Enzyme design. Structure first.
Site, PDB file in Angstrom:
ATOM      1  N   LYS A   1      12.214   6.835   0.978  1.00  0.00           N
ATOM      2  CA  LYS A   1      12.813   5.759   1.760  1.00  0.00           C
ATOM      3  C   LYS A   1      14.297   6.066   1.901  1.00  0.00           C
ATOM      4  O   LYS A   1      14.959   6.446   0.939  1.00  0.00           O
ATOM      5  CB  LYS A   1      12.676   4.409   1.041  1.00  0.00           C
ATOM      6  CG  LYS A   1      11.269   3.791   1.062  1.00  0.00           C
ATOM      7  CD  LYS A   1      10.969   3.119   2.408  1.00  0.00           C
ATOM      8  CE  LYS A   1      11.245   1.632   2.445  1.00  0.00           C
ATOM      9  NZ  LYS A   1      12.677   1.287   2.153  1.00  0.00           N
TER      10      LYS A   1
ATOM     11  N   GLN B   1       2.214   3.522  -0.890  1.00  0.00           N
ATOM     12  CA  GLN B   1       2.775   2.487  -0.027  1.00  0.00           C
ATOM     13  C   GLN B   1       2.972   3.086   1.327  1.00  0.00           C
ATOM     14  O   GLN B   1       3.148   4.306   1.492  1.00  0.00           O
ATOM     15  CB  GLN B   1       4.020   1.888  -0.655  1.00  0.00           C
ATOM     16  CG  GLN B   1       3.568   1.186  -1.913  1.00  0.00           C
ATOM     17  CD  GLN B   1       4.547   0.298  -2.576  1.00  0.00           C
ATOM     18  OE1 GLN B   1       4.151  -0.411  -3.470  1.00  0.00           O
ATOM     19  NE2 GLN B   1       5.817   0.452  -2.284  1.00  0.00           N
ATOM     20  N   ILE B   2       2.874   2.199   2.316  1.00  0.00           N
ATOM     21  CA  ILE B   2       2.925   2.600   3.713  1.00  0.00           C
ATOM     22  C   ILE B   2       4.235   2.098   4.339  1.00  0.00           C
ATOM     23  O   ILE B   2       4.667   0.984   4.101  1.00  0.00           O
ATOM     24  CB  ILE B   2       1.690   2.066   4.507  1.00  0.00           C
ATOM     25  CG1 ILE B   2       1.424   0.566   4.267  1.00  0.00           C
ATOM     26  CG2 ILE B   2       0.492   2.909   4.211  1.00  0.00           C
ATOM     27  CD1 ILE B   2       0.439   0.071   5.308  1.00  0.00           C
ATOM     28  N   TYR B   3       4.803   2.972   5.173  1.00  0.00           N
ATOM     29  CA  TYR B   3       6.069   2.658   5.837  1.00  0.00           C
ATOM     30  C   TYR B   3       6.096   3.254   7.225  1.00  0.00           C
ATOM     31  O   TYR B   3       5.544   4.321   7.495  1.00  0.00           O
ATOM     32  CB  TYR B   3       7.269   3.244   5.072  1.00  0.00           C
ATOM     33  CG  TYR B   3       7.338   2.834   3.627  1.00  0.00           C
ATOM     34  CD1 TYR B   3       7.816   1.602   3.249  1.00  0.00           C
ATOM     35  CD2 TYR B   3       6.922   3.670   2.615  1.00  0.00           C
ATOM     36  CE1 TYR B   3       7.858   1.228   1.889  1.00  0.00           C
ATOM     37  CE2 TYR B   3       6.991   3.337   1.304  1.00  0.00           C
ATOM     38  CZ  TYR B   3       7.464   2.131   0.952  1.00  0.00           C
ATOM     39  OH  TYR B   3       7.566   1.860  -0.413  1.00  0.00           O
TER      40      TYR B   3
END
EC number: 1.5.1.3
Lengths: 57, 57, 57, 57
Positions: free
Chosen positions: D11, D46-48
């Site tokens: 991120k 986790q998806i982003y």
């Protein structure tokens, strides 16, 4: 693959979720997983193992 | 606190989510956050910062 | 409550997660749940049922 | 696609996350999204959106 893009699926048990297949993932814990966009909540996506999901009409 | 347990809220923008406040969290990134159980998908809970949510009737 | 704010916990099994208790939630599916901020990934929080977590030093 | 399976990403801002690309998703809100397995927390994914992520060595 068990499911394809656009299939309508739901969680089989426990926490509910229902909508369209919109992606895929693969880990050692989850060698076949899917991303599902809620049909009730546009834009919200959750990922689950294949065993947690079932296709519906 | 902006919201209390049982308030009906929704995401203001972007990914949708709507249901009841069922908990709270606090981090430096998110000093006031809430857990919201979907009214459409019983048992599924997602957490958001207060600024992302609005109370509805 | 089994845990308090600031306790260091981890997932017992399956997908890993470790860090500090930063909140709480309660649903019929999960009548005692916790929000845990990762100690490895500041700002990222995930929620789990109490049965999925264990306190560590 | 911006990223491929196995790329190491993080991120860019806000909540932290770092690890390997393990899948993909596509919605109207997020026409190019990725699933990322944490390198710190094996099994947790986790998806982003692509705009939230950057490739690292």
């Amino acid at each position: 693959a068990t499911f394809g893009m656009g299939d309508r699926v739901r969680k089989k048990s426990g926490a509910a979720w229902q909508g369209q297949i919109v992606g895929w993932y693969c880990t050692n814990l989850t060698p076949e997983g899917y991303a599902v966009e809620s049909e009730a909540h546009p834009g919200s996506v959750q990922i689950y193992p294949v065993a947690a999901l079932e296709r519906i009409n």
